[PDB]
Design a protein around this ligand. Structure first.
Ligand code: LO6
Ligand code: ZN
Ligand code: ZN
Ligand code: ZN
Length: 459
């Protein structure tokens, strides 16, 4: 109960237009053999080219939608499309490349997958809506065998080179021509009525159909993300650390404490309505305020309607005091809000393309986030950068260049010169803030927010 048994049945109805006469009774073992791959009864870490839905969810960073369309099948050219937007034409003799033989097409496939995946995953998972030509084209660019390590490092092998007879990971495969031990999953095996477009269009209006293979590849991965991360949610699955995860999460905690502490000091709200994570803790535990929590899990489909979160009969009066929405995605924030909203458009190794404008943000856990929409912030303004501290000016225990800044809200800056301690803390805070912003988080606040009101907390 870990891998997909090769003896599991494979429904072949979707394959019978490309492969007429295909047997209805089919296993992964017989299908893999039909594809031209010999498994030789190998107990060396690669029991099946195909994987379970559960294993595919654990390796979502490796997902590459793949489709093959007949341009004209041994005699006809094939259009190979990938969810990266690339279309390659292979001759047997939205980027669109002209027809070239397989020996050069396979070098491009390896280069493209390596650049897309080296900072995301240790493997590739081809996400298919299998009709036949994609499965039969794999023998022209895929090699299989025992699990291996890279020739230049300790990572698992993802590529093979016929020129040198060596194996490489995604980071060391320059000049390699074969994809080695890829994984794959057929979305058609999940139980669907109707074609790819009809199922995809039920949940997404952002991916159209220009009738090229890459359009189908994108729609296939999109539908798979919808099924595994939008209609079904598993927040218990852990994902490996691949970048700045720990620094981003630490920065998020620091920024939240800073902004909320300052909003309470500047406007002295008698009550704070904390809307979001049912396991949230008070981000400013020493604040005088009446802290009230409201449970809402992360929305993965569409943003919450403020009318459903707040109305239908709690302080009841959400208009009293301030509302804190820390990564709680709503359609239109109330005017009295402090907000952190993840911008789905951000380019990063943590943020993967999602469904209907949304993105899949993977940092320890996977969170499909609804599309970022600027109109949600109409009653608020962007929160300006600032650093506030009421801690004593005392160095304790890296060198020094005098800090001059209008945004260092400290007693030392009020009285002229910034002390070394507050200058060090200001620089660390600025780095944390820039880290969080660059990760894709955006901050918004009630229009009356004014850091000028923080200087009088030093009297
Ligand atoms: C396009 C060149 C030439 N090549 C072949 O044509 C041999 O391919 C054969 F061994 F599979 C190998 C090299 C990696 O790319
Ligand atoms: Zn390597
Ligand atoms: Zn889509
Ligand atoms: Zn100071």
């Amino acid at each position: 109960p870990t891998h997909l048994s090769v003896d599991t049945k494979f429904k072949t109805e979707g394959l019978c237009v490309d492969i007429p006469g295909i047997p209805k009774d089919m296993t992964y073992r017989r299908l893999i053999s039909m594809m031209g791959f010999k498994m030789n009864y190998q107990v060396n870490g690669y029991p099946n080219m195909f994987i379970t839905r559960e294993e595919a969810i654990r390796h979502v960073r490796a997902w590459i939608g793949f489709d093959v369309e007949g341009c004209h099948g041994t005699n006809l050219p094939l259009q190979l499309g990938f969810s990266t937007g690339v279309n390659l034409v292979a001759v047997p003799t939205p980027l669109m490349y002209k027809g070239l033989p397989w020996n050069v097409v396979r070098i491009k496939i390896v280069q493209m997958l390596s650049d897309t995946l080296k900072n995301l995953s240790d493997r590739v998972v081809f996400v298919l809506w299998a009709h036949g030509f994609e499965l039969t084209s794999m023998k022209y660019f895929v090699k299989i065998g025992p699990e291996r390590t890279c020739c230049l490092c300790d990572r698992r092998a993802t590529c093979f080179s016929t020129a040198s007879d060596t194996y490489a990971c995604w980071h060391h495969s320059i000049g390699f021509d074969y994809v080695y031990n890829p994984f794959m999953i057929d979305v058609q095996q999940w139980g669907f009525t109707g074609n790819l477009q009809s199922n995809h269009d039920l949940y997404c209006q952002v991916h159209g159909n220009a009738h090229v293979a890459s359009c189908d590849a994108i729609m296939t991965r999109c539908l798979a993300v919808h099924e595994c991360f939008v209609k079904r949610v598993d927040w218990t699955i852990e994902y490996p650390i691949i970048g700045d995860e720990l620094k981003i999460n630490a920065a998020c905690r620091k920024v939240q404490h800073m902004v909320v502490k300052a909003a309470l000091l500047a406007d002295k709200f008698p009550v704070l309505h904390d809307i979001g994570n049912p396991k949230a803790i008070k981000c400013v535990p020493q604040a005088d305020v009446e802290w009230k929590f409201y449970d809402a899990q992360p929305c993965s489909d569409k943003a919450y309607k403020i009318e459903e979160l707040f109305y239908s009969y709690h302080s009841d009066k959400f208009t009293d005091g301030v509302c804190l929405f820390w990564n709680c995605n709503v359609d239109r924030y109330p005017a009295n809000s402090i907000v952190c909203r993840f911008d789905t458009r951000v380019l990063s190794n943590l943020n993967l393309p999602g469904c209907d404008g949304g993105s899949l943000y993977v940092n320890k856990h996977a969170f499909h986030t609804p599309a970022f929409d600027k109109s949600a912030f109409v009653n608020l303004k962007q929160l300006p950068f600032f650093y506030y501290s009421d801690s004593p000016c005392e160095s304790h225990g890296i060198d020094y260049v005098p800090l001059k800044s209008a945004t260092c809200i400290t007693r030392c800056n009020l009285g002229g010169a910034v002390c070394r301690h507050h200058a060090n803390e200001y620089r660390l805070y600025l780095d944390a803030y820039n880290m969080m912003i660059s990760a894709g988080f955006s901050l918004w606040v009630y229009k009356q927010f004014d850091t000028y009101n923080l200087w009088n907390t030093f009297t």
